[model samples]
Target: GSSGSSGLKVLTNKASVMLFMKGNKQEAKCGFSKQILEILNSTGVEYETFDILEDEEVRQGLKTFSNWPTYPQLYVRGDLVGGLDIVKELKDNGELLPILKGESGPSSG
Candidate 1:
C-alpha cells in the first residue's frame, strides 16, 4: 500500500514532464522549488506536479526511488533529471528552457 504512493509511481508515468515538488503549481513550499517552477513555466512546457509534502510515503520513498537526496525532484520522460539546485544551474546557464521544451536529451558528455 505504501509503495503505491511512491512519487516514481505516479510522476514517472503521469506526464511527459513531472516534478515532485514540495508544493503545487500555484504555490511552492521552498524557495528552490519556487525558482524551478518559474523556470519551468517560462519554458511554456506542459507539465504536472505532485507535492511530496502532502504524502509522507512519497516524500521518503522518492529518496530511494530516485537515488537523489533532495526535494523538488525533476523527471523528464520517466527519467530522473535532478533536484532544485541542479535545476537552478541549468536555468542559469540557459539549459533549463531548452530541456523543458523537449528540444534535447540527456548528454553523457
Candidate 2:
C-alpha cells in the first residue's frame, strides 16, 4: 500500500544526508548536481538520493515539501539545505567542512 510518495518519505527519512537529484549518482543531470554529488562523495557519509526526473509526483512534491523550487535539493539531518547555489556558497565560504564533520554550521543556524 505504499505509493511513490510514501517510498520517497521513507527514503528521505532513513538518511541523515539525502539528495533529491535529477539523475543517479553515477550520472547527474546538471553540472551543479554533479558538483554537489562530488562534494557529498568526498565526505564519505552515509547518504541517499532520489532521482526526481523519474517521478513527477516526487519531483513536484519535493519542491513544495521543502518550499524551494528546484531540482538537486540537499537535505542534512532531515533539514532542507537548498539547491546548488547554497551548496556552492557554503563551499566558497569554507562552511562545507564543518557540516561534513557533523558540526553545526550557518546552514543549521
Candidate 3:
C-alpha cells in the first residue's frame, strides 16, 4: 500500500505528459516502450519519462498504482491514460495531437 503510494507520489507532477516505461526516452529497453516513444516523438510533443526498471519498488508499485500491469503506461495531467494500444488507436484516429496539446478536453487528475 505504502509503496504504491510512493510511486503515485512520484508521478504527481506538474508535467503535462509523463510515461512509466522500461527506460528513458533516449534509449528504451523494451520494444513496446520504443514503439510508443517513436509515436510520441513524431508528434513533436514534449513529455517526461520514468524509468521503472531503475527502481524495484516503484516498478511493482506502479503496476499496482495504475492497475495496468504493463510498462510504458502514459499519464496526462497526472491521470492514467493507457498504454501502447490506446495511444496507437488515438494516433490512428487523429486524437493524439489534440490530447497531447490538451485541446481535446479536460483530463482526470
Q: Pick the candidate with the highest lDDT.
A: 3
The pairs that clash in candidate 1 are none
TM-score to true structure, per model? 0.74, 0.73, 0.79
Expressed as tens digits, the lDDT of each residue in 13-95 for candidate 1 is 68766777765786875567777777667667877777677777777777777888676778775568888787777878888
Error of 1 at 38 (Å): 0.7
lDDT of 1: 0.71
Query: How big is the positional error of residue 11 in model 1, measured in Å on the Cα after superposition?
Result: 1.8
Checking candidate 2 for backbone clashes, the offending pairs are none
What C-alpha RMSD separates each model from the true structure?
4.7, 5.2, 4.6
Q: Go through the candidates in order and give each one's C-alpha lDDT.
A: 0.71, 0.70, 0.73
Residues 1-109, candidate 3, lDDT per residue (tens digit)? 6423353655735356676677677676557888887887677898777767777777777777778876678776566878989887788888887788776555795
Q: Write the per-residue lDDT of candidate 2 for residues 4-104, one digit (tens) a residue.
A: 46555565665767777767685775577887877767666666677777777877777767777766777765667777788767867877656654665
Best-to-worst order by lDDT is 3, 1, 2
For candidate 2, the 10 contiguous residues with the lowest summed lDDT are: 1-10
| Cα error, candidate 1, residue 20 (Å) | 1.5
lDDT of 1 at 33: 77
Superposed Cα RMSD, model 1: 4.7
Once fitted onto the true fold, the runs of candidate 2 whose alpha carbons sit more than 4 angstroms away are: 1-4, 7-9, 104-109
lDDT of 2 at 86: 86
